[PDB]
Amino acid sequence: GQGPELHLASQFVNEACRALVFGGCVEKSSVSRNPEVPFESSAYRISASARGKELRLILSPLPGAQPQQEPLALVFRFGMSGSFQLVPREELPRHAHLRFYTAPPGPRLALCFVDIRRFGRWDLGGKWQPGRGPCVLQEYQQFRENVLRNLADKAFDRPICEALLDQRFFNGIGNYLRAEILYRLKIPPFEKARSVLEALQNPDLLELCHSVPKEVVQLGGKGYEEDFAAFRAWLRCYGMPGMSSLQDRHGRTIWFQGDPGPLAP
DNA sequence: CGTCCAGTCTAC
DNA sequence: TAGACCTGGACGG
C-alpha cells in the first residue's frame, strides 16, 4: 500500500476491533523474519492510526488484565502485499505472519497481518520512522511547508517523478499516485523537481499530493475483489491504454501522456 | 508448462 | 545508488 491503503487499513482495524477484546500472545509465523512481539494479556483492545506509508497498532490491556502491563505500540510498513484481515481463528490465510486472537465469549476470530511477498516490516517502538516527512493525507500544511522550505536539498535536483517517491518529502506517495497526480496537471515526469516547485513559491502539484490520495480513501474498498473495480475505473493514467511509460533511474515504471521531459532516461 | 510483472532496506 | 528480498497472477508458446 501507499498512503490511502495504510489509511483504509487503520480505519478497518478501528471499525472491526471497536467491540472486540483480544487475549493471549501475539503469534508470529515461523517463516516471518520480523521480531517476536513480547506481549501477553488476559484482555486487551487493538486500535490503529496511519501516517504516510506507516501504520501504528496499539495493544491496550483492560482494567485488571493480567499481567499488569502498559500498552504496547507496533509500527508496520506494508511493502507490496501487506494487509490486515479479521478471519475465523481456524481459517487463517496462507501468509498470515502476525495474529492477535479474540478472547471468549462470542466467535473466536483472529486479526492477521497478511503479507504474501514478506516485504512488510514491523518494529517494537511506536515511533514513526525518523526521516519520513509529514503525512500527505493528515498533515497537509506541514507536508507542504516542509517541501517549499527545503527546495535547496539535493533530492530536488532529481526529476519531479523521482522526488515524488522521496518519503522524506512525500510520505505516502507511491507509484500509481505519482502517475495520477502529474497527469492531472500534465507536468512532464522528467521535469526537474526544483523547477516544478519553484514555479509555485488552480489546484497545484502539492495540493494534489493531498487531494488525489484523499479521493482514493473516500472511494473506500481495496480489502476494507469488487471495490478494486471502482479503483481501477478511477485511474486516468497508471497502466491505462494509450499511455506512454518509461523506467525512472531506480527502474520503477512512470506512466504519463505526451512529453516525457528534459531528464528522461 | 515458461517468463515477466507488481517499496523499502542494507551492504557494497 | 543497485541488488536482494518474496509470492502469485497474467499473459504467451
Numbering used by the authors: 2 to 202, 222 to 244, 250 to 290
Provide the authors' original text about this structure.
Human endonuclease VIII-like 1 (hNEIL1) is a bifunctional DNA glycosylase of the Fpg/Nei family, which catalyzes the removal of damaged bases and subsequent incision of the newly generated abasic sites.
Hence, we introduced an extra E3Q mutation to the truncated hNEIL1(C∆95 P2G) (see the “Methods” section) and succeeded in the determination of complex structures containing 5-hydroxyuracil (5-OHU), spiroiminodihydantoin 1 (Sp1), (S)-guanidinohydentoin (Gh), dihydrothymine (DHT) and dihydrouracil (DHU), respectively. Despite the very different chemical structures of these substrates, they are recognized similarly by hNEIL1. Noteworthy, across all these structures, we observed an unusually short distance (~3.0 Å) between an outwards heterocyclic nitrogen atom of the nucleobases and the terminal nitrogen atom of residue 242. Oxidized substrates of hNEIL1 are often bulky and contain non-planar structures; this disrupted aromaticity is expected to diminish the π–π stacking with Tyr244 and hence destabilize the quarantine state. Moreover, it is expected that the bases with less solvent interactions (e.g. DHU) would favor the formation of a stable quarantine state compared with the hydrophilic bases (Sp1, 5-OHU, Gh, and Tg).
